[PDB]
């Protein structure tokens, strides 16, 4: 039946609010977005490749400018947008007795800033203002991944509780109110942060990732159905689709045929090496073709001489995605590996053999992208990853990326079954980045090429890469005492980008 | 069931450009939409009132710089955008054998064009090239008007031909693909356009309106589920919303309390003037309250010196829309009041009586709007407009805007029934300040406040206002032959705001 508008019902505040919170994990901002995700997370992930030449200081090159690499920190898109509107949610809750906004507000709150304390190590959390002031002490990293639980905690349990209820669909274009699947959700996000912290504290990691599985508590993700994918693109633009088209070559000057590639940003050469040696059949579904003769799928390198757009870098096989496209925050492959490698290399109790999971997480993505022959692939011990034959080259590598093969070895060593896991996990999460960068910092895996233009001036390692960003110029301006505060006690490093996080302790 | 992105499907490519068509109606653009409908369209049609001190020249005050009057023509977010996506989905509907996309694709291009040509007069029209080019003979009005009806009576013979089949639902954010509301939107379309021609050509007028009514065409729009309403904004933001609220004032600039009445636009004097008069509980769905001292609604008057947003400004009534509001082409109220002029002024046989079609559109728009009361309304013989008295002081108009009354009455003359239509039909459009122009061109109705700022050195009639906007200055440019061509055939009047277009015909 026909429904008047109604801007009082607030109701419309609730929703406004509710949407900007789910803004501030992956920003609608596309210049936002293009910092955290298609510059920093995307190339440090080994998904994206930086492609403007006139990007002569870059994150991916490891000579970033102050602008480029504090906006997880400094961006009013982010913490002063996601603070004030939780502030808003919270009120909301305590006003209409009911609680179910404000616990998935606490959801969304540790999606957001996870990526934040993933990218610096220390920052403030616990102590942020009501507005998201930031100019308060830091939280060491231990201490900040104990909060996440704890709030993570709270919410599944106010879920719980009011599992028969629902939040609107206007105010959610994740799951459209429901309950269930935010409970599913939490305690998927309980799970990827349980592993994170696998070596540094394995005590807890186990506790939390044994609670997070366990069905008292509601689930995890086990369907791509139930996706924590934002859909809030169908009419508008996604970020990432107009920031990787920045600076796109015009048709006129293509020789009359439109170029597909986008701009500033294409396809890493580092997945495609893998994806092409496995013959794998998710492809088409990520990348756009190449311009290259005879060669389908074929990456830019990251951290090179960027090539101009117009004479090569338009030819290098591009990201695939559209302006309708959602963003994605996790999915069920991923669930699935961390299952797998719970099992297999820590030896907590997950549900269900590390094998059965290793083959559900290829299963979930072939799913998830619609792409056949997942069955051979899973049995495949033959096929691996390739070198990089740079069709261009100039930066070619010589040597094959990895020889690991994708079919499960039981009998295989824990650092070859983490490996395979990783690779697929890291293939399955194609355009999460800071996902695939974390861990990346925490397994060493995949096994990427190694950096060959660094701009470090020395102070990072090729191989093992950005360890973290280094600390806002800002932040010793609004914010001295505490920074320099937690450099000297919660950092464990100088401030710089080979000084590794707190999670990131593999031996 | 999950389904899989497939950005290959195109499919794809035919909900990009359908999308765009829609587009074009009333632009998702903010600057688009501000020019062609805050500045333009609101305040001509009596709705909105320019509210930036800095706007020193405007459409409302009829002082325009090329730049504000141009748009409609000169937009390459109109034009162009339209042409180049309508010779894509025409190749799209061809290659697919499916004639649907097109169908639908002409109703929106007369959507478009038809605010286009009543905003200049003779334009490019049945000679526009492939990609929306301009430079090219233009049509008289009555050629452009009489394509208008041969395409939507084309459009409206597909769509019944094919009205088992369907649009993709991610295509369209009218109708989701319902081919049959399309096919009621179409003949609504027809009859707006016939009306709109009831003076100029009667028999074409009463011919092309009695076509679009009868049952064997399909019918027009009777109930508010279906609309001519592009919800094409809940996850971004409606440019009418935004425009309206450009520069508005900051709370820490209104004493500690935002000010909830936008920056820009504000409401008009004139429709709360009639509103207020008339008890009229629609008002609260409209318009923000005032921040004048016991007085609830109070519009700013057009065509004024316009005072500062931050000292006075603020506190008149603003347009009560918000970021996720959809953008209104047509109405079910409309309809209504469209079969009541056409059967009490001009005696159309129109398939009711004008008494029943009148109380009919004054309903749907009460429904429309969630307001309660409209029964006690119709029957009110009583309530008559208000005068102006400014809380400001400065730019009251001392007489009442007219003494209409709301209760039909049978036995008025043609005159007095056709204002009390146009009256409830221009309220019942809130937001479509193009059509409503229209109206109150054709008709004189309803009786609006002269304006007192008129900064045309005596070219426009502070009573009769604009009577269309001057043509582009680049037509003398990039088409002088073909301008000068229409001014001296077409236009029947100096290449001024004083000059009627051809329908406006009326003794
Ligand atoms: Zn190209
Ligand atoms: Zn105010």
Redesign the interface.
């Given at each position: 039946?026909?429904e008047?508008?109604?801007?009082?019902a607030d109701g419309?505040a609730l929703?406004?609010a509710m949407?900007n919170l789910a803004g501030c994990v992956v920003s609608p901002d596309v210049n936002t977005a293009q910092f955290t995700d298609c510059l920093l997370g995307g190339p440090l992930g080994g998904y994206f490749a930086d492609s403007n030449a006139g990007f002569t200081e870059t994150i991916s090159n490891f000579n970033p400018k102050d602008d480029w690499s504090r906006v997880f920190l400094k961006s009013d898109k982010i913490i002063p947008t996601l603070y004030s509107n939780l502030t808003q949610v919270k009120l909301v809750s305590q006003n209409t007795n009911d609680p179910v906004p404000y616990a998935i507000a606490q959801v969304i709150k540790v999606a957001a800033m996870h990526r934040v304390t993933d990218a610096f190590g220390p920052i403030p959390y616990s102590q942020i203002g009501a507005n998201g002031e930031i100019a308060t002490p830091y939280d060491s990293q231990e201490v900040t991944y104990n909060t996440f639980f704890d709030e993570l905690n709270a919410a599944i349990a106010t879920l719980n509780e009011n599992s028969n209820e629902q939040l609107v669909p206007?105010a959610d274009?994740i799951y459209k109110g429901d309950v269930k699947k935010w409970i599913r959700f939490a305690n998927s996000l309980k799970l990827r942060l349980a592993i994170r912290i696998a070596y540094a504290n394995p005590v807890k990691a186990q506790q939390m990732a044994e609670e997070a599985v366990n069905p008292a508590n509601g689930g995890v993700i086990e369907?791509?159905?139930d996706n924590a994918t934002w859909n809030?693109?169908?009419?508008?633009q996604n970020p990432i689709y107009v920031a990787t088209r920045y600076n796109q070559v015009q048709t006129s000057d293509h020789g009359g045929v439109p170029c597909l590639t986008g701009g500033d940003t294409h396809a890493a050469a580092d997945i495609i090496c893998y994806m092409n040696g496995y013959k794998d059949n998710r492809r088409?579904?990520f990348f756009t073709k190449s311009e290259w003769a005879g060669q389908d799928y074929v990456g830019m390198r990251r951290g090179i001489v960027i090539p101009e757009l117009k004479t090569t870098g338009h030819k290098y096989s591009g990201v695939?995605?559209?302006?309708?496209?959602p963003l994605y925050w996790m999915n069920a492959a991923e669930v699935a590996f961390l299952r797998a490698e719970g099992q297999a290399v820590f030896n907590f109790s997950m549900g269900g053999t590390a094998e059965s999971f290793y083959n559900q997480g290829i299963r979930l993505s072939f799913?998830?992208?619609?792409?056949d022959g997942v069955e051979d692939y899973l049995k495949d011990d033959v096929n691996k990853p390739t070198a990089y034959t740079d069709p261009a080259g100039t930066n070619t590598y010589q040597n094959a990326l990895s020889n690991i093969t994708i079919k499960w070895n039981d009998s295989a060593d824990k650092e070859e079954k983490q490996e395979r896991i990783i690779v697929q996990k890291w293939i399955a999460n194609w355009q999460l980045g800071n996902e695939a960068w974390a861990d990346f910092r925490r397994t060493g895996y995949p096994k990427l090429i190694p950096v060959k233009e660094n701009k470090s001036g020395g102070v990072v390692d090729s191989e093992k890469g950005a360890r973290r960003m280094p600390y806002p110029l800002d932040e010793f301006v609004s914010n001295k005492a505490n920074v320099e505060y937690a450099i000297a006690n919660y950092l464990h490093g100088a401030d710089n980008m080979a000084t590794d996080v707190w999670w990131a302790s593999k031996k």
């Open positions: 039946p026909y008047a508008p109604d801007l009082s419309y929703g406004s949407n206007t274009y369907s791509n159905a809030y693109f169908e009419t508008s088409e579904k695939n995605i559209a302006p309708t496209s799913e998830q992208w619609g792409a």
